[PDB]
Amino acid sequence: ATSASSHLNKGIKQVYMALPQGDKVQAMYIWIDGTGEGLRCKTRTLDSEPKCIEELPEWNFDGSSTFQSEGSNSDMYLVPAAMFRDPFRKDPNKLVFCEVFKYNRKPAETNLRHTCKRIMDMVSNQRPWFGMEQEYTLMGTDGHPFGWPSNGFPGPQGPYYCGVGADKAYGRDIVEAHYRACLYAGIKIGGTNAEVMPAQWEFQIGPCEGIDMGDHLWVARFILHRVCEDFGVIATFDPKPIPGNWNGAGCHTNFSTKAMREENGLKYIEEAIEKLSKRHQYHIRAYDPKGASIRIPRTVGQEKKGYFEDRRPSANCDPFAVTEALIRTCLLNETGDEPFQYK
Amino acid sequence: ATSASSHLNKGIKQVYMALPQGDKVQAMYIWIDGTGEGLRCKTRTLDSEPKCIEELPEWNFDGSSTFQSEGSNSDMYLVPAAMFRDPFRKDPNKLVFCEVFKYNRKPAETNLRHTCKRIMDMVSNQRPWFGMEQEYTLMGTDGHPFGWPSNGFPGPQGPYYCGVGADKAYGRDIVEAHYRACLYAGIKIGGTNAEVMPAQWEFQIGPCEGIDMGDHLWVARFILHRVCEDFGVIATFDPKPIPGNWNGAGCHTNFSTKAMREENGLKYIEEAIEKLSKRHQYHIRAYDPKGASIRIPRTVGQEKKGYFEDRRPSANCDPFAVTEALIRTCLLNETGDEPFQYK
Amino acid sequence: ATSASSHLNKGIKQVYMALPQGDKVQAMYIWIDGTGEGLRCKTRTLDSEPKCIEELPEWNFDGSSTFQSEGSNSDMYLVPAAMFRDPFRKDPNKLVFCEVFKYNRKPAETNLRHTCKRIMDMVSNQRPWFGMEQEYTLMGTDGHPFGWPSNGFPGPQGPYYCGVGADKAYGRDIVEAHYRACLYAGIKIGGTNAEVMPAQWEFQIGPCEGIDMGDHLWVARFILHRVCEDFGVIATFDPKPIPGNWNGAGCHTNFSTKAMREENGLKYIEEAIEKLSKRHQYHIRAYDPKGASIRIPRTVGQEKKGYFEDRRPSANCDPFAVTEALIRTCLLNETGDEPFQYK
Amino acid sequence: ATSASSHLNKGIKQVYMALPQGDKVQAMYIWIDGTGEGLRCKTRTLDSEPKCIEELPEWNFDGSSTFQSEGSNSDMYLVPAAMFRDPFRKDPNKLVFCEVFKYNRKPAETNLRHTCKRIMDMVSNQRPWFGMEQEYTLMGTDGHPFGWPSNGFPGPQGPYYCGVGADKAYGRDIVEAHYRACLYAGIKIGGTNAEVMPAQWEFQIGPCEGIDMGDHLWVARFILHRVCEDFGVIATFDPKPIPGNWNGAGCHTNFSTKAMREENGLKYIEEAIEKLSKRHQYHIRAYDPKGASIRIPRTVGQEKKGYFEDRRPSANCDPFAVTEALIRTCLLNETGDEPFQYK
Amino acid sequence: ATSASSHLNKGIKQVYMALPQGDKVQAMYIWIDGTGEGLRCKTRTLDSEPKCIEELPEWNFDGSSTFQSEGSNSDMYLVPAAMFRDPFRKDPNKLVFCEVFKYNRKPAETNLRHTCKRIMDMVSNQRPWFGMEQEYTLMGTDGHPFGWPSNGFPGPQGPYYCGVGADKAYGRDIVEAHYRACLYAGIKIGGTNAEVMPAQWEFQIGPCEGIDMGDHLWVARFILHRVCEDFGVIATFDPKPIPGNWNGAGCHTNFSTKAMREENGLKYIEEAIEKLSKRHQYHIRAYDPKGASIRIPRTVGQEKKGYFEDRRPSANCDPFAVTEALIRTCLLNETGDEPFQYK
Ligand SMILES: [Mn+2]
Ligand SMILES: [Mn+2]
Ligand SMILES: [Mn+2]
Ligand SMILES: [Mn+2]
Ligand SMILES: [Mn+2]
């Protein structure tokens, strides 16, 4: 099944979209829900196209409707963090990803970006690069994977991974649209592939210099949601969408530094892996918003330089928390149940 | 459900629309129904494109069919008031919002613009600015909200406010089309967002210098109706569309003056609020066509200058009456059950 | 029946596709499945458009999901072999057909290209030209031929071969789209025709200089699968799609050399046919991935120069194996159950 | 949605059923699946109607298909335990509920009846009476509750508990059919009611003298499954069918003895409750097949004699284990993690 | 999908069926098709109800339409062999299973009954008893199993063997109707069960004294076809209905003699098994119309008397050939590629 809005005549929408916009420019503010994994958005009008993120004014929203404020002082604030081109509106309109504050102007329970940015600024000399692969499932509005038979299973696993064909890959139009929208918007998307079960896909984001990783992955998730809403399907990042033998279906984070990219970086990668081996429980706790767990590429080992792979994060993981934990455990040499405060 | 006209082949319509129009120009006269909240329209042909509103001739219509005239002398008059570009016809065609007169050439029961314009002209030195947020619900032709399940509720409140996704926001194509149409037509639309229940949305109009507020909000309502008619859905401004816990779902009016925008304007805002506190019943009567009721932004209080917010008007309110009452109570210092006549 | 993805609004997809892509370029790596007849693909991002195939980097994939690797070392490699323009993405994006390696960097069980390329390089002086005609059937997602009646047969054979009409040819849009996509991508497609039963078609690829034959036929098969996926139908190369009197429905390979194209080449063609007559069982074994069998054109015989036709290969045949066997039996004069190793 | 078998013409079935059966009699053997909560059945033919359970011969089945045997010796045995009239076949045909044995003629992992019967025979002097209330949900074949809107919720809780009306109770025909079938078959069903959410129902079984409780509840579950299969819906005893605020949705067991039914039995009930208070974890473990947790009726307290209520068992509980645990903790005064063996 | 005839109003049919028939009686002659596995039938009128099979006259049919005669002399003959009550017509009407002859009055290629009857008459002193279990699949008219999802699989194997529930057993109404029809008609049906995949079932016929086995199994197959035709589904005895892991899905024949039923019959069973072990290829050839292959029940071994089981015959096997081969190999001690002629 598909949503009722997807059955509206989209040619009418495209007739209205093709009107010359004028001097005004629409900016769609995007922020993370109070649940830690949802995204909320609302569009305002700017008198002119902003050249930089600093020209974007701050905004506010009702936090009581977003699961992240109390009744007495419900208003929260939106401080713009990253700016991207609007694929849906095709320019000069801008997507504005923003942080959330409380009435006290202090980071919200779900604003993990504020600290993550501080951590990345501390280790800015090492220039960390992250690459994150996000796996999702396309679902109908009836709660079942898109293109699956009603009350039924498509078939045994094996033909669908990177498959091509009407019976091999489901909803590739969503994937192509999302890829093109992320390219236009400036997201650092590096590729896509179809996963082992049909209607399950994956897009990779990276390499990114820092908080760019979290910003790009969150905006890529938003673009996926908007594109799927246009098509009338649902993008699910739940680690266990369909019950069965398949277990993980989660994000993989690739971490490198300046030293690891240069010669004799394999020993730095080994040191980082050994440091991570001690903090397994902390990373398992941090990755959840509520063969090998950590793996090394063999091509990197042959070249003795490169990156590593962490298979532990789930699909609904928060990139800010993941990257901050990876930096703290490896670069900052932190140990303990709770992170230290670099006040 | 959607209307039968929405299932006509719209590509045929766009083939006919793309014909070179020629020297003639079509103007769609729009006026307020006798009910006080409905809109009526009819298009004529002009030999040339009018540069200003004064070139638009007066027109007439059958008031017996519009609930606002008696049988003996049914004819009413249309005097053009505001001119906008026609989004639907894409230029040089014009939307003409007009006032209604009786056979006596005297303002109609529903023409509240004529007095409101006089009031705004009296206080033109203070330069009042209004901002109005209009909340509407998208409904099917079956009387239920669009995208809702038949005989059913979408789910608990909370995921839908400013939500993105096929299961989070219903009928966003209508919203995008209406936003672009209002931009092209010259309406001062400042942004939109999705409301707490799905298929419920809101657009903000403002700031506006005067009767511009009423003109822009009425033409924005007309554009919403035309766009929804193109999509085959209904835009409802009823304050209580769906029975349940949700109560208000009504317009919010933001009022500022020249003094309140300048430094030390917070005391002027406080004076206006104190004046409004006495005339609560009068404003409640005037807003109906048939936490705090009046609120102050906290950012304005921190900056000690700006505007205030009135949460009392409903969604089907008449902007002319609302703005006239706000001016009379605050700027004109009027008191009493009935307004004074500045003859 | 058609796939559920085909019922998505494709106008939305085309709106997203028309976005200006930017400096980045998407390359879709394509490789042969472990089954020997399936195709797998996945797209990456390149910083610039590659001018030649050598600029394409090597890649890797999970061979456990592709029926061609064991659990311990599942990773396989993709070495680019041929580059074509991407019809689906309309440039500068590129389709990259690649060979598969094991973790040992040794040809995979299904990588028959590596040896075939060696064989063609050995006989490069003779300049062999191959022409292959591929016959396929368009099927619904319900496992029946496209356009056929449910639980029914279209009619007696005879009106459908090269037929024109709604009741004569089924799914010609797929054929036209595939032909245009192969032209744009640079495939050497020489023509198409409709076969004796409806929804069955055939496209010819050739002439090709060498491994170009295998590359072009495999990429043409991939383009057919992608186009059919866009239309929501399935392209089947099974030699026996629908049970009945029809038997072969398989590929025909046309083989010529430099000598056979020149004058008095008919005797060379006769020598090649006599050599092939001895190795019938070997070619029957090699053609399977798991009137006359070999025929001569009469126009060639009248002109005493040209090519021959082999009707023995099936529709799901591997072009690399077919062309390698044809070269080895004719040009290399090989005899025996197993081919010799030119180490 | 409903199953495809439910859309077969049932009048044809009733025409065939009305044929005079003859001298032969069909007996449907029923046994518990290896999963501990599923039911399996298969019908044989008897030359004459059995007057007692002892005339029923033993049978066998393939335990490899029932998740309860290994490959080498898959055969299991069926020893008849209880006999009931066949509601579906309307007599002289009999439903035969049987225990399962292994090839060693030793109770199967899921045959908890064999021990429970021993325990009840030990305490046969006290004459324990049990009453069990079973709560189930009617679901479509699409995995959603029957009569619920697609992708939707019926409404707020409150109108549906014991409700009457097309919008208040869903699938009452299943309930009436199941009640009448259980009456005819001899099940001690004491009543039904509709639960707080629509399509959720409950039937009470009791009072029963002993292993009669387990036999009657299991056969009532089987009759519910057969009736729902006739109607094309699914009866689910999962404690959490639909995600949401509702939590328990589980069976309630009412336990009395001969002493508790007589005068001054309230002190015996208090002693039993105090004994149960110590073994909470053991009963929680035993109830799972993989206000107050224990409550006392107030009418019993006013009359100072009667029974108690245990709210702890879930809906998918095994009655044999529940009743055996209740007897062992109260009557047998057992304490400890594992039960004692009365060998 | 179901056949179009199943969607006719069956109440009309039952109104016509309930008419008092009168003195005339309808007899439906049934014979085996020329293909060896199909059944053909046609009904005549008798002036009175026949008390015995000998009162049934011989008939004839067009063998050119039945794949078992040449053009010059197409007529074949029907000699009545067995008489049963007509379940479909509810008495006094009779089903007449008949042998087929050629114009020469000599057994037809597919009339294997004539010889089988001779063989059984030779060994009539030993009184052989056979029991045959027939496994079939219910299919829609679209060629897929009944109740399966379109283009889909129901689920993993394991819940369906002897399952009860709308999601566990498909088309049980067909099974109940067929069981009751076979009981009424006098078929020696001993029971049914649901098989490992849904819509697959099995009925057992036996014990039978001789050619009674072939007669009863063929008439049971005919009754299954007629009942399924009434329901609009297809009964398939193909050994491999749905491609996949499941392989056999074929009939099991249980063979006993007078000696094997008496004490110390286990040695006779062992002798029969040893004789069968030599003639495996002959029985494999004879069973086809175009753990252990032969197994012994363990209960029989414990009681040292009873029967054996042959798992080798397929589902579409001819019972006459199977029983004749079992008698010839065991009782007649025959050896060789071709059977001896007891002329
Ligand atoms: Mn990975
Ligand atoms: Mn407000
Ligand atoms: Mn040919
Ligand atoms: Mn209770
Ligand atoms: Mn068997």
Coordinates of C-alpha atoms and ligand atoms in Angstrom, one line a residue, chain A residues 133 135 202 252 254 295 309-311, ligand 1:
Chain A
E133 CA 26.8 3.5 5.6
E135 CA 20.8 0.8 5.7
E202 CA 21.8 1.3 1.8
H252 CA 28.8 0.8 9.6
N254 CA 34.6 3.9 8.9
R295 CA 36.7 -4.9 11.4
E309 CA 35.3 -0.4 10.1
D310 CA 32.9 -0.5 13.0
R311 CA 30.0 -2.8 12.4
Ligands
MN1 MN 30.3 -2.9 6.0

